[PDB]
Amino acid sequence: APRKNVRWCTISQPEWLKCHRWQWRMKKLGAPSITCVRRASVLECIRAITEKKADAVTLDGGMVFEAGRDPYKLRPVAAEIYGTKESPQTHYYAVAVVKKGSNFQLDQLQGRNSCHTGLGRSAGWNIPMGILRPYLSWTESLEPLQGAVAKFFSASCVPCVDRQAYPNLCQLCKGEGENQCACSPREPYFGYSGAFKCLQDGAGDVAFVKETTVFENLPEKADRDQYELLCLNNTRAPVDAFKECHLAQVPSHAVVARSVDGKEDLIWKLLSKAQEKFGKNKSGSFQLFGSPPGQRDLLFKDSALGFLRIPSKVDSALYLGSRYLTALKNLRETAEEVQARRARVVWCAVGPEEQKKCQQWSQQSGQIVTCATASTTDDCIALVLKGEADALSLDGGYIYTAGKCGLVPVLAENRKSSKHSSLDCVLRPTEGYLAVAVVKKANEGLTWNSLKGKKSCHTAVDRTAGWNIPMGLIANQTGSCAFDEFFSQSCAPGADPKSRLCALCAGDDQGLDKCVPNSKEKYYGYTGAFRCLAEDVGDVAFVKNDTVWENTNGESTADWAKNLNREDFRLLCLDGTRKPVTEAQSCHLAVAPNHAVVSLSERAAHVEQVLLHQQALFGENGKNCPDKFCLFKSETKNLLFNDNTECLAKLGGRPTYEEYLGTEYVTAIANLKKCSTSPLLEACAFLTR
Ligand SMILES: [Fe+3]
Ligand SMILES: [Fe+3]
Questions:
Q1: Ligand that comes closest to the CA of residue 61
Q2: Which domains are delineated in the chain?
Q3: What residues bear carbohydrate chains?
């Protein structure tokens, strides 16, 4: 079928020859047929793929980044595994190898001859330029990195550069005629082994490659001895010392496919079969990870142990990692364009309504705070990881997911409290909020023991009050992991839209975006889920004490709420009792930990300082609060923060997400998550690999 086979993109004749040799041994094994597409440059394949002319190609990390940028939107589906069968690695090292006997060090490359694997490649270009930036004397306001580099080295061979604009950089290249500097193996000194040969042939003084390049080209140690590495501290060392003498560690190459309609599973079915039949140390007629004499790294890096399947949620940015992603980014942006990015705090807004409140806050703040937006909290978390956003306030259940991804609590949302009216809000200890089950008095006979079969309203899936606590307790008493099988129907924003957990959700004013986990969905959040109950859409709602009081007896003023009486409602206790909504202290399901602001540990220090100041202006008793703008007031819609919040308190020290949530709650969620797999959670385990 037009999708029952994978078309592989090749950028050279031998690669094409290898591909056909691969396609041949494949059918004999009966697997998704392999079609081979011919091309002449890496770009051509990237473009070819996104244009549905091909489905797969293995790319270097720096090309993987470039492939994920909007025009193409490609994504890593499988990572090459290196190292050894007992000690595998999914990363490698960028080293600078030089002929033993020379004298120059890292800080003396000026005027030398250079050998690069290719332009935009991890080891051959990205890492070095990063390290060598201080000595380059480059001004983006005058010319591009290439210009600076062309004025640094006297001559080199950086395949792919423009021999017309920057001849200086294609001199040492050995390509024949038009092939000179070609961005493909059509150029001898192209790739890892090419740049190495560029050095071996004494054309250049340095070769920027990876740790294994030497051991792959020179087997007899006697030969190796003639070569050394350049260490960061400006000293040389033997090539087997790369673990100590390296410029940087980078992520392995990856196979990339289309983001949408990419044949992922098909590509992976083939690779997993291919590696199991013709992998390392495996059958020796045809080697998947080997190229004929004089040929190298055809299709896949030579001597790779195999592949690793990449989870659906990790895209190019995530796959590369914060460290590498930052480095690459610093290469494409201005020096101040980056300083600006660091001086400001980028808030992540979830939905159109929160986005609007944020754009407002941004204006009032003076542009110190800026905004980024996502349709879901999970997406905002990913944005913070990629460095697109700095922070946001998360419910306890989300702090577990953000925690499982390395984000940390910074300040906690402090609701005005009766107790401890002794201290000031910013240093006042946090007192959780009570999660409760509310029902309508009229709903006779409905107690905790009779929730089975009823209809339910939940703030959203994965949140404390509306999900973790209720479903946690229901799972323990039910034994089963089937929650969508407990209630006949419900509204739990975030669940499968085609599921019955979304069968009672509204969507926006036009019935659109039904079940979407953001304020656009009528029955989302504390207030949304309460309204779901009030309107008789569900038999029970799972919210917190505060919600009942804030939207009854005319405290909301919103149509559905203005005429609601708190005496019309009751709370379901765990002892099978119903109680007036004034009996919360004795009739709650659990006391949850306050919502809090998270961020990357390396950014936390900054975010906090900016926040404590912001809140001094638009917080409860801020300079311009009533009059110009109030941070914790969103007209009962709880946008960005809860409306009943007085301030954001210091967490006293630097608790981890586990410390903040409490052991009790953490395991509770943990055991419940054992019933379901969360894409972001999977993607995150992989982030630590
Ligand atoms: Fe590489
Ligand atoms: Fe909550």
A1: 1
A2: 5-91+251-339 (3.40.190.10), 92-250 (3.40.190.10), 340-432+595-689 (3.40.190.10), 433-594 (3.40.190.10)
A3: 233, 281, 476, 545
